[PDB]
């Protein structure tokens, strides 16, 4: 598009970073992440701890889970597995429960340094409506 709808100055910081990465890298991961940054808050539904566990429970373990949305906690998920999640935002319950399981929490700018081309990443988004 042309301008992000958000008034967050750090969300405009991330759009500036992923505009540069989408232009100067063949990886369609950067183009997809940049498209979802421009999208509104309703079009980025929250993703729960239970939903990122099912997409991990296959042979997709040891991959950096990337969710360009907020991460919410599920009280019905009794045990959290070890997992590295990069997201826009984390709730306090979610952040504590990844850290209790031995996992790590990343931001999208820490993702861009580590995996600029989006290598070995599991991209997820939440339920629409």
């Amino acid at each position: 598009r042309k301008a992000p709808k958000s008034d967050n100055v750090y969300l405009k910081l991330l759009v500036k970073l992923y505009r540069f990465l989408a232009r100067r890298t063949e990886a369609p991961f950067n183009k997809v992440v940049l498209r979802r940054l421009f999208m509104s808050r309703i079009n980025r539904p929250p993703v729960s701890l239970s939903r990122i566990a099912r997409n991990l429970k296959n042979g997709n373990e040891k991959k950096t889970v990337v969710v360009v949305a907020t991460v919410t906690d599920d009280n019905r998920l009794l045990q959290v597995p070890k997992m590295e999640v990069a997201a826009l935002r984390f709730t306090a319950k979610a952040r504590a429960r990844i850290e209790a399981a031995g996992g790590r929490t990343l931001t999208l700018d820490q993702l861009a340094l580590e995996k600029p081309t989006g290598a070995n990443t599991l991209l997820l988004r939440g339920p629409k409506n």
Binding site: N8, Y10, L11, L13, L14, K16, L17, F20, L21, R24, T25, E26, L88, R89, F90, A92, R95, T107, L108, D109, Q110, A112, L113, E114, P116, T117
Partner: protein
């Protein structure tokens, strides 16, 4: 200043918010060794010459 750490730990229902970016310096993000190593070659210049 010693009190200032205490008063923000005592407000109920409020924690100190986590930023959505970890490093707010864009020039460290983009002009870094990690990003510039995987970039393509430039397709053009800032000034584009008029062909015809």
């Amino acid at each position: 200043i010693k009190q200032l750490d205490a008063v923000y730990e005592s407000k109920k229902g409020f924690f100190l918010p986590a930023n959505i970016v970890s490093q707010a310096d864009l020039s460290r993000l983009i002009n870094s060794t990690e990003i510039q190593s995987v970039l393509r070659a430039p397709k053009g210049e800032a000034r584009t010459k008029r062909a015809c």
